[PDB]
Write an enzyme that holds these catalytic residues in place. Structure first.
Site, PDB file in Angstrom:
ATOM      1  CG  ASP A   1      96.688 110.243 -11.754  1.00  0.00           C
ATOM      2  OD1 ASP A   1      95.644 109.329 -12.349  1.00  0.00           O
ATOM      3  OD2 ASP A   1      97.449 110.742 -12.675  1.00  0.00           O
TER       4      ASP A   1
ATOM      5  CB  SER B   1      85.692  94.483 -17.975  1.00  0.00           C
ATOM      6  OG  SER B   1      84.157  94.550 -17.939  1.00  0.00           O
TER       7      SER B   1
END
Ligand SMILES: c1cnc2c(c1)ccc1cccnc12
Length: 330
Positions: free
Chosen positions: A35, A199
């Site tokens: 994770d 992004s």
């Protein structure tokens, strides 16, 4: 030193990925969920409440000659989906694909919430976010990655997740045969303890690319792609019959529809997620309504590039002094 391990989806939908981890002496192999959105290494154990264990392999510190109780240390975690676990802490030898760390904190679960109990294929989590998120009290503990860092040939780990197929987690090196073209690196912010990056935009299908800054986290522990409402609405508007369902808890679409691809920007590079990766199948057995892999992050508070997005790329987690994230097509 280096480490290399195969990761396998737990089911036909790629809801999660498990990677075998050796803990203790003699080794006890447990299948953990790697994770990058958390920083605790916790496992089901001989101390977990008997009724809360349903088929998981448990770690037994009494059978490990190298296990040591970390006197007075406790841990408690509350994940984003309402799930939680807590218990005591041991130190033990932990190995991943041949890479060994001695004196790693192994958090033994005494209590686990029902959603962990129900997933019989997941024996625990191996947190790969920054050590500032570790919940061990009163003395915070380091992640497996942080403990291995000095020994690694290079302070990096790579995630190469498969679509309905096994993949690889590599520690200490970049496999130049696992990707095509070049790796584009982007800045990481560690302020919230996550592999947080920006992004540069997105495209739906063969449409025009929209340049817009999307701040989000690279999270191997989250199944889906969680993006702002404006982006998610623009994607689902291209699917005939798609709609947001409050009873289901998200966007659903007719199982017969063909899904467009989704592109996200990494600097000047583009990563294309094929539309087939966004299908999470029927909402219930026999239903003709299917669950979407792109959901709104409005109720979450953070944008998450989960397994849906990461599995479409070769991903480098560079844990150098100034951390970066690398993305390549594969
Ligand atoms: C992550 C989160 N929610 C889901 C899935 C994966 C997969 C299937 C599904 C079906 C109905 C509702 N939620 C989900």
């Amino acid at each position: 030193s280096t480490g290399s391990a195969t990761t396998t989806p737990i089911d036909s939908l790629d809801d999660a990925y498990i990677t075998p981890v050796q803990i203790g002496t003699p080794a006890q192999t447990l299948n953990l969920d790697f994770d990058t959105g958390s920083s605790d290494l916790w496992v089901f154990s001989s101390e977990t409440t008997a009724s809360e264990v349903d088929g998981q392999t448990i770690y037994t510190p009494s059978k490990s000659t190298t296990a040591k109780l970390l006197s007075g240390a406790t841990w408690s975690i509350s994940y984003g989906d309402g799930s939680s676990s807590s218990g005591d802490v041991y130190t033990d030898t932990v190995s991943v694909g041949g890479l060994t760390v001695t004196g790693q904190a192994v958090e033994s679960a005494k209590k686990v919430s029902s959603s962990f109990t129900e997933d019989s294929t997941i024996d625990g989590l191996l947190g790969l976010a920054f050590s500032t998120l570790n919940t061990v009290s009163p003395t915070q503990q380091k992640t497996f990655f942080d403990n291995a860092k000095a020994s690694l040939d290079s302070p990096v780990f790579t995630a190469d997740l498969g679509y309905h197929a096994p993949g690889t987690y590599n520690f200490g090196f970049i496999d130049t045969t696992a990707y095509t073209g070049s790796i584009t690196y982007t800045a990481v912010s560690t302020k919230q303890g996550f592999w947080e990056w920006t992004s540069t935009g997105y495209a739906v299908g063969s449409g025009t690319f929209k340049s817009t800054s999307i701040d989000g986290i690279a999270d191997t522990g989250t199944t889906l792609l969680y993006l702002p409402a404006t982006v998610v609405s623009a994607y689902w508007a291209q699917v005939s019959g798609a709609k947001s369902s409050s009873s289901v808890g998200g966007y659903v679409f007719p199982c017969s529809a063909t899904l467009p691809s989704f592109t996200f920007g990494v600097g000047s590079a583009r990563i294309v997620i094929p539309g087939d990766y966004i299908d999470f199948g029927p909402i219930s057995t026999g239903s003709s309504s299917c669950f979407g892999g792109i959901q709104s992050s409005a109720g979450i508070g953070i944008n998450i590039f989960g397994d849906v997005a990461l599995k479409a790329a070769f991903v480098v987690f560079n844990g150098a002094t100034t951390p970066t994230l690398g993305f390549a097509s594969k």
